[PDB]
C-alpha cells in the first residue's frame, strides 16, 4: 500500500535531546507515544523503496 | 515435576517445591546455601534458632554494604543476617519434604538435604511516581524453591617385550 507507514502523526524531537533524531509519535496516554516512525529501520514504518 | 536435579534410586528420597513465591530471591538463596547438605532435623533446629536470633545466616554472594555481626564467626564470615520471611518459606518446604518422606516410609533420622535450588521467578512489576513527573519501576523478585532430601546409606596394564623380559628376570632372581 502506498499509505503504509505514513498514516502517523509524528515529528522529530531535535538534536541534543539525548535520544535519536528519528521522528516520534506525539500525543500521550498510550504506548505508541514517543516511538520512532517513518523510517525503514523503525517498527511499523515504511519499507525502503516500496514496490510499485 | 522436572526438578533441576533428581536422585538415583528415587525410592529412598523425597522432594518438595514451591513456585512464584513472593519472597526475596537473594535472601532465599543465602538461606538455602546456608542449609545445603545438612541433616534435616539439625537444619530445622538451626532455622528455629535463626528466627530466635541465636544463630545467623551467612551472606556470601549478595552481601554488599551489609552490617557485621559476631554470629558469622561460626561459618568463618563477617556478614550474616536473619531473613525471617526466607526462613519461614524454607521451613514450610522442609516440613512438606519431611511429610513426603514419612508418607513414603523413609527413616526420618537418616534424612539429609541432598539438593536445594533457588531460581528467579517472573518479577512483580509495581511502579512508583518520582519527581519531575517520572515513572520508575518498583519490582518484587519472587523465588522458585526446590529441594530433595535423601536417606544416608553406608585395570589391564599392557607392557612391551623388554618390560616383560625385565619382570621375568626379576622373578627369576627373586624367589
Amino acid at each position: 500500500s502506498e499509505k503504509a507507514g505514513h498514516q502517523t502523526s509524528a515529528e522529530s524531537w531535535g538534536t541534543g535531546r539525548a535520544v535519536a533524531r528519528i521522528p516520534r509519535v506525539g500525543g500521550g496516554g498510550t504506548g505508541r507515544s514517543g516511538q520512532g516512525a517513518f523510517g525503514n529501520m523503525c517498527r511499523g514504518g515504511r519499507m525502503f523503496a516500496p514496490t510499485k | 515435576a522436572r526438578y533441576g536435579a533428581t536422585s538415583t534410586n528415587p525410592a529412598k528420597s523425597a522432594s518438595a517445591r514451591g513456585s512464584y513465591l513472593r519472597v526475596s530471591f537473594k535472601n532465599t538463596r543465602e538461606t538455602a546455601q546456608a542449609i545445603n547438605g545438612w541433616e534435616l532435623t539439625k537444619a530445622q533446629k538451626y532455622l528455629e534458632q535463626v528466627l530466635d536470633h541465636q544463630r545467623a545466616i551467612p551472606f556470601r554472594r549478595f552481601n554488599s554494604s551489609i552490617g557485621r555481626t559476631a554470629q558469622g564467626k561460626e561459618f568463618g564470615v563477617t556478614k550474616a543476617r536473619w531473613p525471617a520471611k526466607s526462613v519461614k518459606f524454607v521451613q514450610g518446604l522442609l516440613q512438606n519434604a519431611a511429610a513426603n518422606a514419612e508418607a513414603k516410609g523413609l527413616d526420618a533420622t537418616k534424612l539429609y538435604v541432598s539438593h536445594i535450588q533457588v531460581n528467579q521467578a517472573p518479577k512483580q512489576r509495581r511502579r512508583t511516581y518520582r519527581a519531575h513527573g517520572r515513572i520508575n519501576k518498583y519490582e518484587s523478585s519472587p523465588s522458585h524453591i526446590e529441594l530433595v532430601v535423601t536417606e544416608k546409606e553406608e585395570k589391564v596394564v599392557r607392557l612391551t617385550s623388554r618390560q616383560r623380559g625385565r619382570i621375568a628376570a626379576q622373578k627369576r632372581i627373586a624367589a
Partner: protein, 49 residues
C-alpha cells in the same frame, strides 16, 4: 461453579503479576516523555528547579 472459579483464578494471574488493581486498571504509559527528553538548557529560563 468450582470449575468456573478455577478458570477465572488461572486467568487472573498475568494481570496480578502486572499488579493491576483489577479489570478496570488499564493505565497506559508512554514510551518516552518529551518534557524529560527535550532538554537543551541555556543561560536563561529553565523548565524545572
Amino acid at each position: 461453579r468450582s470449575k468456573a472459579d478455577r478458570m477465572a483464578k488461572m486467568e487472573r494471574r498475568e494481570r496480578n503479576r502486572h499488579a493491576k488493581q483489577g479489570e478496570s486498571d488499564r493505565h497506559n504509559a508512554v514510551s518516552l516523555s518529551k518534557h524529560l527528553f527535550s532538554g537543551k538548557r541555556g543561560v536563561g529560563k529553565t523548565d524545572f528547579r
